[PDB]
Structures are given as structure tokens and as C-alpha cells.
């Protein structure tokens, strides 16, 4: 129910390197994360830092700063896909230490598009537009990089909503191990 | 409520050849204008129609719808601007006949550029911001066909919005005469 | 209900009576031009009466009936019965010279155009000069009906100005004040 | 509505039938009995049917499609303003050789859409049906634009945007006329 | 676009045709028995013809019309145009032999009904049981419209089944499916 | 509403019918006993056809409509169509003896009269007596018109009772379950 | 609010440190992030020590119920789940989950097993993205009971088409438990 | 809230069971139960019980938590013990369930809804029926009753006094001073 | 959660604060300040200031039943108002023990309350509120002194009373100003 005192249990799992990134991504969640992570950077720049997943996606922009950040931090990050990874979710799962990238043998990862609105003059529609095309392309290029495909299977494949299950989510190259039980 | 007669108001001005575009111009104004302009053509397609517009604007294409109309029909068309022609109403003006767009003193003009909005995934966003644009070029177009003006100028006149007294839209083009009694 | 007779306004158009009483909005504009086209159109030297009961309303919309007024051959006889605030004050001195009339116990408002304006500062500064010029045209036209100086004008429509049947015949606004008919 | 009855009843007695607005059960019917109204006056005269249709229910239009092909008059189709979804339809639905459209005009074709919701089991029948829908649409488009299925679901798969000499290229119209000649 | 000019469904009523158009409540139930009454009064043999355009509504006003369309002596001749969903689909196969029609791009659906139920645990069960009462009664009636099994209804109606023109033909519920 | 050359209700009406569809208030009350009387005045001995589709409604309404009945010297021929529950079973019973008629697939619905009361206990009281009071006349009618004992109409009405139209023809709700005339 | 117990804490802290865990309640993300949180300190605290896991849920999100399924099989220690109250939907599945000879039920709990429910809108394209995903659930949540409860996936199917619901007993014999208690044996 | 006074009580081993009785307030009893008996199993447990009643699930996961652990139960009620509350009354130890002069004890069927399909309705219905038994049987055994006059007393609403309630067999002694 | 909180320090002091509407809420916190109370020592005196405008029925019996249960005797002390419950855990107190400070008002009436469903239901409900309506009446003859005709027609509409008023009445005992 609320959060349980052993501090914050979260609070004792960051005291692990352990941070947690389930639910919805806004700026607020991308200030916790990134807070989280550079305060582990100081405290080791060499420990790994664990990162655990269950979000359905959310904001372009704050994803974008958790990714950054865990592409910036000395320190290796292992993701761990549990539940979903869905959206910046499955982004910010690929985005983890090569060799490093773990999903539970039930998640789902899904990869698809931007979305997003436009409103005002068609001067005003057309710079929006253009705008959330530079995205599409970044993110693209971005999901390319990771998993090393090709710009054209990251087009075919994201273009409509994409569900992986874990094997195939380490068949495309968005993960790396498949785990039941630990080794 | 609509005065009757010995018919409701409107009607006894559609026998006297007179369609009344007042109000915003959705798909359902655009309806019983174009209805009361082909039962005007019907009636003679050598009589003039007066069309008396009073409107701050509306949907691009039911006004286009009526614009179309207007140019369809054989029969000469009097506009006349009173109170305001806003937006698409401001185009209903300029598509009378030449000559015959006539204005009262002390109603105004304002042309802009068409406003919109785009929501989906980023190829959607695209397709709907181009099609925005195709609309600009396209009334771009027909107010340089009306004014007589450069595609530059309307370009440059209609980006924002761009308010006018009766005097200046007729020397931008939009009206011919701007009469306070009738001569 | 509108009393059937038709309705009771219907019965008035006959007797060249058009009725501007409420806000004043594009919809009444709509029918009191359309009123005032189809009292021309049966004569255009009998005269109209147009009574008006307004609190004000959208400045284009009055501006619509201001004009078809003075386009129009036929004389308009204006009647106040009851208010004639802001464009109704207007519709109220636009009447035909001499023949703007009132009752004892109405009143006339006269006040400067209002409205809002969002979006950029580009845009801020375009409806900002333009509520400005329909302050500038609603000024001259009082001063053109009230045969006041644009200084009386300005002065008077900075605040909120309200005048009794005296007052407004003072300022120029009518011209009669009749308890019983002439 | 403006009297001289309804303006449009006196359309509807120069045998002019206008779809205009989103396209529902209640558009269907109105339209559908115009329609039939019309073919009992005369089942060889020809029916004028002006759209200006942003598109609406698919089972909606297909009944004025339906009614369309069934009855034997002569169906002159105008698009004006915009004919887009549903409104595309009916306006390559015409008689061949007598879909037109006015010059600023514009089409628009896409796939259809919709929702589903349930259990697992019903949200596989919805979406097996609102497939069915896909090919039955599909299909009738190419039936009368003369286009092979291949290009039908390759544009229809996104909204796409016609002009009226565009559309007439794609076979969903076949005159862009201006001035009447 | 705006009940055209009398209303175009009345010019319809003088032909003998009754618009079924849309969901069926008790509104929807008056105004049909009215009609097909109305037109008995005129003539107890003339034909009646009954467009269908529904996606279904409340059991009780369908099966009002439906109860109608048995009593009134009037061949019936129903049309399935657009759609012709839940009742609207019993409603299509309750024509007269042989009189059952559809549009070639018409859809027929036919399901189990559907409501709800609240109160106590005693009142939970009476409403229980009156709808599934209304389960068999509608499959009995499907059943002997559409020369079916019980079973072949059961199994079909137990999850939302969509048909095409063709199919319902086949099940029972139409008889001809015209095309051009 | 249709119309012929009026209202589809008013030419029913010319045939002495009237219609007492959906939920019974103070105003399908008015209408109601409005016809009865306009047609008791056009006629003391023709039969007067009253066609019930109605889920209930408030108890004054459905007394008001039922006295009316019983007022009036015209038999009442009552059908039960679609159904006849809470109040529309009560004036199901209501109709001359032998006249209460009800097509196959409909269904009839009989149950206690419920209610609300707030405010003071003492205006608790007052009302709760007074719902009480309509309890037994309720039953009493249903007593009177069904050929049953006060204890068959106490436990059938307790709780929501569905029938029949065959059930309700052997409770004496009504006479004669018709499938063609 | 919360009872203190006296440091100081939350009644459920109180029991954390007992190694008890509480699903009660709806399971979304936030509450398989709360379990799953409980589950990694109880594994760091001792790999050996039994994780007791109580269960009082009438279902939630799929995605969330997996996430605490897959942290429950891959901690090293042993789980005792127990059904008080009610087990429905993904509760029925976390109390199956529990380690062999674990799963408990008290006398007057009830479980409940059905298929994945959702929604969909948008294109047709979409549609058919959502329902075949919406059906992987599916064969998936029914692989998963197979796997604890024993049973062929002809039964699960057959089962868990429409709602089942179970007494203790009757998801004993079914394979979702394995012993209905009613005192401390 | 004046640690809280609540955290005081249950330190004198009191566990306040009031106001409605959802899922929430079904855990947080169950878990001062629990550090309760760990705290020792032979002590007893005192239940102030003021509910006008809840869910029937919750309520039941309170009643098994009461029957599981091994303390004796006393149960007061205070102010009413009504619906599910009326239950976890009965529940308590025999002969430790008292009652307050001016309290109110009240027995009703379970209520609940349902929606869908046919087929659907009738699981529910069904389930709300083994629920209305379950609750039946337990009022009988805590009640000393048979079920038949379970079933006629819960048919309706049924309110009783605490001296009606202790005739009843919903408590056993009704005290005004210690 | 405001001042460092006051009513623990006045709890410390022996005094229970009933103020605002009577709720089930309140009814748990009141009862539970008093049982803490008797803990301390069952001998010292409870204090208990009223500022209440009524409440839940059955919260007010719980809290009219721990008064009556605990042995400590209490000091009741109607401040601004003590009306409906209010009047009654006022008169509740302690022979001799209750107190009103000299603007203070007590209102007095009959139990109000609903009923909605079946005409069955309805009665049953109907009822109920007949026995607390009594019930009440025989507390307020209880504490007050007297008699039940003189009970039910004071409180078959709204009665409201002064300190001065409601000690006449056997409501309060003590009316002071100045200590
Ligand atoms: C495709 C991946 C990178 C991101 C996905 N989310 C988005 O694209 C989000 C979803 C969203 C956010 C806010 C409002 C409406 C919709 N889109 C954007 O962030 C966004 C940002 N700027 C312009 C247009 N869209 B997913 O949900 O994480
Ligand atoms: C600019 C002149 C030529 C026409 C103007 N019409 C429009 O702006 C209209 C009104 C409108 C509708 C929805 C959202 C925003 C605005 N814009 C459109 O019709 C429109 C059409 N397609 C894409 C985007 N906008 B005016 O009548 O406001
Ligand atoms: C000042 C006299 C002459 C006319 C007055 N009319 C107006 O003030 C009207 C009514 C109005 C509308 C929207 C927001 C606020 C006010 N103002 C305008 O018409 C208006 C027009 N353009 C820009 C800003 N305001 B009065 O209220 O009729
Ligand atoms: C694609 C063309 C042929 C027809 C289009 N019609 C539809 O999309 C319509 C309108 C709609 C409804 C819900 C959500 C989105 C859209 N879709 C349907 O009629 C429909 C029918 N059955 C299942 C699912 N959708 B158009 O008129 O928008
Ligand atoms: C299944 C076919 C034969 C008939 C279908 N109709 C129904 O399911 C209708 C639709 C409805 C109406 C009111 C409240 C809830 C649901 N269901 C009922 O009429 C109904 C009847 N009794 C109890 C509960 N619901 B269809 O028209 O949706
Ligand atoms: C029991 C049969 C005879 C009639 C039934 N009617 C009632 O129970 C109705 C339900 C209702 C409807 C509308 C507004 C308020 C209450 N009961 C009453 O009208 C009513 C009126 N006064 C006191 C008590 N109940 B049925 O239509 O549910
Ligand atoms: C059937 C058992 C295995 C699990 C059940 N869970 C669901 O049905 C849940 C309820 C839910 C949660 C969030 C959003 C929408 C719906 N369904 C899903 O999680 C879900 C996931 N993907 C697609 C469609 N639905 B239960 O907890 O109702
Ligand atoms: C009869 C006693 C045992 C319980 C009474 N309450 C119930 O039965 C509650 C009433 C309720 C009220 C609001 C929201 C949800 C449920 N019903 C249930 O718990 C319930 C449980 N399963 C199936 C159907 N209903 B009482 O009001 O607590
Ligand atoms: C008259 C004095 C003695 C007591 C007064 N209390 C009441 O009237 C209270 C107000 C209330 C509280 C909760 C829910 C509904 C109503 N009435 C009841 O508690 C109540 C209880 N059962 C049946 C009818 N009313 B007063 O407002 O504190
Ligand atoms: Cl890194
Ligand atoms: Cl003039
Ligand atoms: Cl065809
Ligand atoms: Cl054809
Ligand atoms: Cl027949
Ligand atoms: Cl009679
Ligand atoms: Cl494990
Ligand atoms: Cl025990």
C-alpha cells in the first residue's frame, strides 16, 4: 500500500544500485531517474547500476533525458524488461550496457512510432510536423544503433504497433538474455 | 423568431433573388446556400443573385463548396459585405462577379491564413499538415485570382491576420464599390 | 409563444415596425436587415419604425443594422422604450434626423467598444489596434449623429455613461421625449 | 430551412437528392427514401445526387450504396466541397460517366476504423468483421475505379488526399468541370 | 436533409412501407405497430414491406413488433438494408416466407441478449432467470424462422455472429440476396 | 409521428384504439383518459381497443387510467404487447372480462409497489402507512380482476413475478393468448 | 491511517519484516512495483529464507500480474502463497505461482479464472495488431495455469473461456492450490 | 489524529474495526491481527467492531483471519454491527462477544449487481446465490442456529436490539458498566 | 496537523474535544481518547467540551455508550453550541457535571433519516427510526429528569435553548460566566 519502511523501500533498492522506471515517462519520472542515476555515478563510477522496467511509454522528450543520461554515466546499466516495455520503455531497454539488456521470460516489448498533436496556423501545423519527423527519425536512429538493424527493417518494423515477445524482442536485438531463473 | 408573411422572411427575400450567408459557414450553412443558388438558376440563369454575407468565417470546405457554386452558376452574383466578411467570408466576397462586390461603409475585411489541427502517429501528422498546406497555396490562389494580386502579396497580406476597412479590401481587390445611400 | 394572430412581430412588420429588443448578435442582424430590406422593397418612401430594447452587443453585427439603416431611401423612425445601451444607443442616434424618439423612464448608455484578444504578442498587437480603430469608427459616427465635437465624444465614452431622455437629447443622441403620441 | 415547402423538397422535385454532412443511420434513410421516391416517379430519369460528406458510418453507406446500384435510374454523382471516407464512395458509386466534381473539391480514401471491446474471444470476432469490412470496402472501390486491388489497399492503407484531377486519374470521378459546357 | 416534404416516410406509409431504422425501444415499437396496423385497416392482403436498418435495442419492443408482424394477416416483406444486428435480424427472418430480402452489402448479426441485473440475492435471481428465459424464447424463435437445430442456434448465438447476405441466406434468416 | 392524409395515433384512434406505451406518468395518464373519454362520447357502446407495451410507472397514473376504465360503460378490449409489467399489468387486467387479450412472445410482470420517504420519523411514518395502504389496494384489485385469494396475490407479489402469457391467462391476468386472429 | 508500530513504521513494514508480503487489492503497475520491490529485499535480506505472500486481489493489469509472476519464479526462495478472501483473475494466477505444496487457501476464500479481457481502436491495421496480441495473451496466461495447475490446455481452455469460479476445495482439486487450512494445522 | 491513538490501542492488543469495510480496510485489520498473534498467540485480541458493512469478500478475509489465528477474540460492538459487521461480531470467541446498552445489530442477504451477455448474468448470479449460502452457514454455526431461520431472518432486512441480538446468538453478553 | 499537536496536549490534561458534525470518524476517535483516558486512571475526571451541531445517530450512542460505560466520572461543557447528539452527550455527563459557558445554545429534536425501496423495505426502515426515536426520547428522560410527554413534545420539532434554559430543562447543570 503506501511505501513500506525498512526509508522508502525504493530507498534500500537504490542503496542496491537499483532503479526503478515502471509507469508512465514524464519529465517527473525523467527527474527521479536521472537524479537517482547521477547520485550513483558519485557515489561509484565503475558499479553497475541495475535499472528495472515496467512502463507502458510516455513523453519523447523525457525519455530522451533518461537515455541520454544512461548513455552519459560511466557506469554500466543493466536493464531489466519485467512486465512491458513498451514505447520510450523498450527504448530506454535497448539502451542498456551491450551484453547487459535482461527481460523475464513473460514480458512484452513493443516498438511503434511517435505520436502526437498539431493546432494552430498551418504555418504553425507545418513546424509541428516537421518537427515530430525529426523525431521519428531520431528514434529510429536510435533503436537502429542498439540494436544494430538496419534503418530499413527500424522503419518496416515501427511504423505500426510492433509486439516482440522476449525471444523475439533478443532476436531483434533489443535485449540480450532471456531468463528464467538466475544462472 | 423568423417574422412570417402574407413565408418566413429569408424566403420572401429568396423571391426576390437574395441568399442571406450570415454566421459561421459550416457543411450545413453551405447546404441551404448552394440549395437556394441552384433554385435561383433554375428559376432564370440570366437574373442577377444578390448574396448578402455577414460571416467571420468557417470550414474551408463548405465554404469552397459555395465558392464553386458561385462559379458554376451562369447567373451574375452581387456580393455585398455587411457588418463583416471574415475569413471565407471574406472569399465569398471577392468571388462575385466583377464589378458587382459591393460593400457598406462601415464593415470590415480580415484575411488570414486557414488554421487546422493534425493528432495520430507521425505519418498521419505529415499527411494531414500537407493536405493543410496544399489548402493554403489553393485559397492563396483564389484570392489572386479575385484581387488581381501577386501570390507573393497574399502570401505576405494573409499570413497573419490582416484586418481592412471597406476602401482598403477594394483597393487590395477583394470589393469594388463601397456605397453609403444607393446612387 | 408568439401570439398568433401569425405571430404578434409579424403583424407589426405589416405596420412597417421592426423590433431590435435583446442582445445584439449576428442572428438578430440577421433578421432585423432582413426586416428592413423587405419594408423597402413594399416602399421605399414609407417610413419604419424600429424599436429597440437592447443592452448592446457585437459591434459588427450593430454595424451591420447601423448601415442598412442609412443605405436604406426609407425614413427610420427610432423608438427607446425601455434601454438603449451601447449599440443600441447607437441604433438609437442613427435613426433618420428628427424623428429619434423616447420614453419618459428609459435610459441610454454610451461606452467604449470591449472585448479580448490571445495568442502571440504579434498577434496581440493586430486585435489590439484593430479594437482600437472600431473605437476611433464608433466615436465618429456618435459625433457625426450627435453633432458633438470627437473631443465630447471621447470624454464621454471613456467610463460608463449613462443618461436619462433629457440627457441623451442634450448630448444629441435623440430628439423627442414623448409621454403620449404627438 | 428556408420555404418555397423546404428548399430542398423542390430539389428533390428536380430530382436532385443531396448527402451533405457526416453520413449516419438517420442520413441513410432519408437519403435511401429520396431515393426510392424518386425511382417510383420515374425509374429512367436520372437522379442528381450532390455529396459534401466528410465520410460516417460504414454500414450507414453502404445501404445508400446498396440502394444506388439497385435501382435502375441513372445516378449523376457531384462532388462538391469535399467527398472523403464514406462520401468517396458514393461519389465513385455514380454512373459511370457521370461522376463529377467542381474544381476546389477534394477526395479523400482511407481504410475504415473503429473499436472493439470484451473478452479475447470478442475482440477477435470485432476485428475479423472490421477486416471484412476492409476487403468489402476495398473491393467496391475497385470495382468502379477500374484499379486492381493491389493499388486500393497500398492507398487506402493511410489517408490519402485527392484533388479532383487526381481523382479522376484514380477512376473515383470523371469529370472536373469548371463552367457548365 | 431535414424530413423532406408531407415527411417522406408518410409517402412511403401510402405505398406500404414501414421504415425499421435504427436502435428499436419502446418509441421505436409504438410507432411500427402503428403503422403495420394502420395498414391492415387499409387492406388485410395487400403486401407490407418492412426496411430494416438496426442494430438492434430492447427485447421486449422487438418482440412487440415481432408478435405484430405474426398477427396481422398482411404478407410482410422484409428488407435487410445497411445492417440488421441483434433484433434487427430476428426481425428480418420474421417476414413472410420467401419474402425476406437483402441488399448485397448488407451485414446480418445475431447474438445471445444482453442486460443487467441488481439488487438482492433473491432479486438477482429472478432477473437471472427472466433473461435467460428471453435467451431461449429468442432462440426458439430463430429456430423456427430459420428451419434450424436448436443446437445450431445455441452455438451461433452464444458469441456475437456476423453473417454476410449470402450466409444468412443459407442459415435461414433471409431467403433472396439480390444483386446487380 | 407519420402522417396520413394526421398523426398514425390519431387515425388508430378513429378506429378506437388507444396506445399505452412506455412508462405511465401524469402526463400519458392525461393523454390516456383524454381518448377514453373522447371516445366514450363518440360512442357509450362501441368497444374501445387499449394497447399495452408499458414497463410500469407511477401508482396515481396507473389509478388514474384504471378508474378511468372502470368509469366509462364502452368494453375495453386490452392487448398486451411486448409486455405489461408493474402498472401495465394491473390495466392488462383492468379490461372487460373475457377482452384481456396479449399476443404470444409477450410477457407480464407483477410486484409490489415500491417507493422513497425522507424527513423526520414522524414523516416517516406518514409515508411508510401510505405505501402500505397502496400495497393492499393494489392487491385488492388484482384480487378482484385475476379471480385469486389475497394470499395467492401476497405471495406471487412480493417479489418481481414474470409469467407467461399462458401463465398470466391461468393466474387470470388475461383471457386469451392469440397467436392469428 | 497506517498503524505505527514503535525507530517506526507501518503495520506492513512490521510484517515485511516477518518476510510477508501483502497483493491486496487491484494489481496495476504501481502494486507490481511494491512486490516486486518487497520480493528483491526479501531475496538480498536472506536467498533462503520462505517469502509469504498474501493474496486478497480480484484481478488487475496482465502486464503488471506477469511482472510480479516472473519475479516470484525467478527469486531463489521459496513462496507460500495464501488466498484470504478472494483470488480473481491475475490473483487466482499469483496464488497458482506460489512454490509447489505452498499454495494455501483459507476456508471461505473464493477463486476465480477467465480469459484476458481489453479494448482496441483505431485503424483496421490496428485493430488486428491489438486483437492478435490480445489472443498471445491468451494462449500465454493459459500456458502459465497449465504449467502450475497441472492440467492439459484442452481444461484450461475449456475453463477459463467464460468466468469459473472456484471454491478452496474445488481449485485444489483443479491444481491452483494445494491445501485448504482452516486452523494452524 | 492525536504516534496515533490507534497504534496506542493496538499496542493494548485492540484492533478497531469501523466504518465500511472494503479490501483496504479488510488488509489493515488482517495485518494488525497477524503482528498481534506474533507478538503472543495466547493473549487475547479485543475487536471494536462499529461497520454498517462491506464488501462481502473482505469481510469474509477478516473472518478467516479471526477463525486462523489462535488468540481468543473479543468483539464489541460499539454504536452498530450491521451487514458484514454483524458477522465479524458473531465471529468472535464464544462468550467474548459483548455489545453496548444503545448499539443496533443488523442481518441482510448479500446485494450485488450484474452485467452482460446471458450466459454471463447467470455465473453471476449463480456466484451471488453460493455467497448468500456461505453467509448463511456462518451465521449458523457462530449463531447456534438452524440455516432455515438463517435464511428467513437475512431474507430481509432484519434489525435487532443487543438483547435481541444476544437471544439471536450474535453475542453473549450486553453489559452497560464493567 | 496544525499547532506543536494541541489536542494530544489537551489529552494529556484530561480533555476530549467533540467538536464539528459526529461521525463514525468522530465517534472512533472520541471513544478511543476515552479509553485511553480510563487507562491513565480510572478515578480522575474526563473533560469533554461539546461544540458539535449533531450527527450520526448510531455515532452518537456509541460515544453516549462509552460515557456511560467508563468509570471516570465526566465533566461535559457545552461551548458555542451543542445541538441534536450534541445536546445529548451534553446531558450525558456526570450529574452535577455539566456545564455551558453563558452564549451557548442546545437544540433539541426528533431523529430524522430516509427510506427507499420496496414498500416492504420501506416499513422496515420506518420502523428502526421509530425505535431510536423512542429510544432517544428515554435517554434524554433519563438524564434530564423528565417525564416522557414532557420529552416528546419538546422535541417533536426543533427546540432550541439557552445555557440558563436547558438547565431548567435538565439538560446541563452549571451556567458560568467567570470561573
Ligand atoms: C514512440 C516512442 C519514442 C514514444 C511513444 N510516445 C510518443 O511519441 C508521445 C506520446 C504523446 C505524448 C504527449 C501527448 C500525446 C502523445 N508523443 C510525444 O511525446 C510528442 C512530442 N512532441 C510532439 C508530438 N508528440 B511511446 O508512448 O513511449
Ligand atoms: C483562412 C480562411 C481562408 C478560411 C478559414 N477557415 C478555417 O480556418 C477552417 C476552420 C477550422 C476548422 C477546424 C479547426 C480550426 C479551424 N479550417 C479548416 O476548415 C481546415 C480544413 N482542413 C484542415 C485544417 N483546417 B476561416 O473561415 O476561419
Ligand atoms: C461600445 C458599443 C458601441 C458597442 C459594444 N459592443 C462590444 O463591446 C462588443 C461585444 C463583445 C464581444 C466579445 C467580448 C466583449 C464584448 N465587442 C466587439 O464586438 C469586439 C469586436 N472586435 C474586437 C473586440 N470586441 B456594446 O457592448 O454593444
Ligand atoms: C473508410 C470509409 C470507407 C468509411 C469510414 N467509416 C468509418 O470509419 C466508421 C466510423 C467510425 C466509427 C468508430 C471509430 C472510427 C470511425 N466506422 C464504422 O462504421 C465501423 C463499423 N463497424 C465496425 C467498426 N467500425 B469513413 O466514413 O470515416
Ligand atoms: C440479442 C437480441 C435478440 C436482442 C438484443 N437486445 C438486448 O439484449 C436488450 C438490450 C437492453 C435493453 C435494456 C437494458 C439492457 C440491454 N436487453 C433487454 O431488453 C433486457 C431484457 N430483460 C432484462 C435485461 N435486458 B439486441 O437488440 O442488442
Ligand atoms: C407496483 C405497480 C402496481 C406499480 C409500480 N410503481 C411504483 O412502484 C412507483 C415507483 C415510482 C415511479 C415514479 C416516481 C416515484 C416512484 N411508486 C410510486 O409512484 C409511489 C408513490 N407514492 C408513494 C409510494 N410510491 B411499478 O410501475 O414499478
Ligand atoms: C484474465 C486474467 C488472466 C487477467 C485479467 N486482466 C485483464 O483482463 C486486463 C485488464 C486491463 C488492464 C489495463 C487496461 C485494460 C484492461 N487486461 C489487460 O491487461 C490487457 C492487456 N493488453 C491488451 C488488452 N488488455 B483480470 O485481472 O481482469
Ligand atoms: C449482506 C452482508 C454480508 C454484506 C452486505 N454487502 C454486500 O453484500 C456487498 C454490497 C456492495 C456495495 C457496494 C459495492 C460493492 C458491493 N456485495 C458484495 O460484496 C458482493 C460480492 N460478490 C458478488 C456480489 N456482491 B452489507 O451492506 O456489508
Ligand atoms: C435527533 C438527534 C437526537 C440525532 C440527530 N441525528 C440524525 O437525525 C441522524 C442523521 C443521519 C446520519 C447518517 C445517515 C442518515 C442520517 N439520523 C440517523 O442516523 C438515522 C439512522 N437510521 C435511520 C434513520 N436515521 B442529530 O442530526 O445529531
Ligand atoms: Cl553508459
Ligand atoms: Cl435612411
Ligand atoms: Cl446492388
Ligand atoms: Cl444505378
Ligand atoms: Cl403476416
Ligand atoms: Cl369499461
Ligand atoms: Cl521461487
Ligand atoms: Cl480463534
Redesign the interface.
Known amino acids: 500500500?503506501?511505501?513500506?519502511?525498512?526509508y522508502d523501500?525504493?530507498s534500500?533498492?537504490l542503496r542496491?544500485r537499483?532503479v526503478?522506471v515502471?509507469?508512465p515517462i514524464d519529465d517527473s519520472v525523467a527527474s527521479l531517474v536521472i537524479a537517482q542515476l547521477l547520485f550513483l555515478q558519485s557515489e561509484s563510477n565503475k558499479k553497475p547500476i541495475h535499472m528495472?522496467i515496467?512502463?507502458?511509454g510516455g513523453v519523447v522528450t523525457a525519455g530522451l533525458a533518461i537515455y541520454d543520461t544512461m548513455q552519459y554515466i560511466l557506469n554500466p546499466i543493466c536493464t531489466w524488461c519485467?512486465?512491458?516495455a513498451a514505447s520510450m520503455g523498450s527504448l530506454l531497454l535497448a539502451a542498456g550496457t551491450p551484453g547487459m539488456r535482461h527481460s523475464?521470460?513473460?514480458?512484452?516489448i513493443m516498438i511503434?512510432?511517435?505520436?502526437?498533436?498539431?493546432?494552430?496556423?498551418?504555418?504553425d501545423?507545418?513546424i509541428?510536423?516537421?518537427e515530430?519527423?525529426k523525431?521519428?527519425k531520431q528514434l529510429y536512429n536510435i533503436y537502429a544503433k542498439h540494436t544494430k538493424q538496419s534503418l530499413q527493417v527500424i522503419e518496416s518494423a515501427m511504423?505500426?504497433?510492433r509486439?516482440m515477445?522476449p525471444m523475439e524482442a533478443q532476436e531483434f536485438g533489443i535485449l540480450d538474455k532471456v531468463?528464467?531463473?538466475?544462472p
Not at 1 to 6: D, G, Q
Not at 113 to 123: F, H, L, N, V
Open positions: 500500500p503506501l511505501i513500506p519502511i525498512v523501500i525504493y534500500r533498492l542496491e537499483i526503478c515502471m509507469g528495472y515496467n512502463s507502458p519485467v512486465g512491458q523475464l521470460p513473460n514480458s512484452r511503434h512510432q511517435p505520436s502526437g498533436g498539431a493546432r494552430g496556423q498551418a504555418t501545423i507545418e509541428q510536423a516537421r515530430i519527423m523525431l521519428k511504423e505500426r504497433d509486439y515477445s531468463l528464467v531463473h538466475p
